Design an enzyme around this catalytic site. Structure first.
Site, PDB file in Angstrom:
ATOM      1  N   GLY A 166      54.158  99.021 -22.288  1.00 12.21           N
ATOM      2  CA  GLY A 166      54.553  98.983 -20.912  1.00 12.21           C
ATOM      3  C   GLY A 166      56.014  98.639 -20.880  1.00 12.21           C
ATOM      4  CG  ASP A 209      49.123  88.517  -5.649  1.00 12.79           C
ATOM      5  OD1 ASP A 209      48.170  88.826  -5.266  1.00 12.79           O
ATOM      6  OD2 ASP A 209      50.140  89.190  -5.989  1.00 12.79           O
TER       7      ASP A 209
END
Ligand SMILES: Cc1ncc(-c2ccc(Nc3cc4c(cn3)cc(-c3cnn(C)c3)n4C(=O)OC(C)C)cc2)n1C
Length: 256
Positions: free
Chosen positions: A17, A132
């Site tokens: 990634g 989060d």
């Protein structure tokens, strides 16, 4: 393209990634063993941005000894120009997996759940609240689920969403906030949708989460303990919401 991290040579097999300055690669050592390397270019990093990586590295280091539901950090190299991080290589992240997976086995969900809890429990024990949490923050390694990051630094994407947001986070504009987030990840693996996926407008959705007059759907499923887990986690008032240790003593986890 090769590289050396602390007098050890790693051959590149692929790039897993790329996020921001940082890049992640599938690499191989002298013994042909596989690792992930998070390279970070510090050439254009601000004083604040620099501190977030120093914090993420430290937390990732301290937590190694504590739980095995935290990604293994083998070594690192931090200069004024770059950061190299030699970590254990997972098969796939939970988000990419969930999208591919479609319907999921009830017994794999139970195990992935115990792992997600054990991991988030450990980050809380060190006074860290993730705030989060998303399926992406999780990684499948060795048929096991392991937390990739602590929120503290920049997230990445293979080569963001608002459905997992706790109402208290939206109100003020606690570790129970991560219970609501894990609750959304379980609700998704149980019903195929997040509690507020049905509200198209982000301004509208943010208001359906904070509104108690808006009842979240809870259909009948063969797993009774799993249905109750979901009701416990998605309680809007943080003081009413279940805790990770209370979840760790719940029949869904401890009984099969
Ligand atoms: C279809 C698809 N898209 C993405 C993937 C995929 C494939 C393999 C992996 N493996 C993997 C990813 C990893 C690590 C270790 N192993 C470590 C990390 C990492 C980076 N920063 N921190 C704090 C940890 N990591 C990572 O960030 O992966 C991203 C691409 C999700 C991760 C994702 N796959 C299979």
């Amino acid at each position: 393209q090769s590289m050396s991290v602390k007098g050890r040579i790693y051959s590149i097999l692929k790039q897993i990634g790329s996020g921001g300055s940082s890049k992640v690669f599938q690499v191989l050592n002298e013994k042909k063993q596989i690792y992930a390397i998070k390279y970070v270019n510090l050439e254009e990093a601000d004083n604040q941005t620099l501190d977030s990586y120093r914090n993420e590295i430290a937390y990732l280091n301290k937590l190694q000894q504590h739980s095995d539901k935290i990604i293994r950090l083998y070594d690192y190299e931090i200069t004024d120009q770059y950061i190299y991080m030699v970590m254990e290589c997972g098969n796939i992240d939970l988000n990419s997996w969930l999208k591919k997976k479609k319907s999921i086995d009830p017994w794999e969900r139970k195990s992935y759940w115990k792992n997600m809890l054990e991991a988030v429990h450990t980050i809380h024990q060190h006074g860290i609240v993730h705030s989060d949490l998303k399926p992406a923050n999780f990684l499948i390694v060795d048929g096991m689920l392991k937390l990739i990051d602590f929120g503290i630094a920049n997230q990445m994407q293979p080569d963001g969403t608002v459905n997992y947001m706790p109402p208290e986070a939206i109100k003020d504009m606690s570790p129970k906030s991560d219970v609501w987030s894990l609750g959304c990840i379980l609700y998704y693996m149980t019903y195929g949708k997040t509690p507020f996926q049905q509200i198209i407008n982000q301004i509208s959705k943010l208001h359906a989460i904070i509104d108690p007059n808006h009842e979240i759907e809870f259909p009948d499923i063969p797993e009774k303990d799993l249905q109750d887990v979901l009701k416990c986690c998605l309680k809007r008032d943080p003081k009413q919401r279940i805790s990770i240790p209370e979840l760790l003593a719940h029949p869904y986890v401890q009984i099969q």
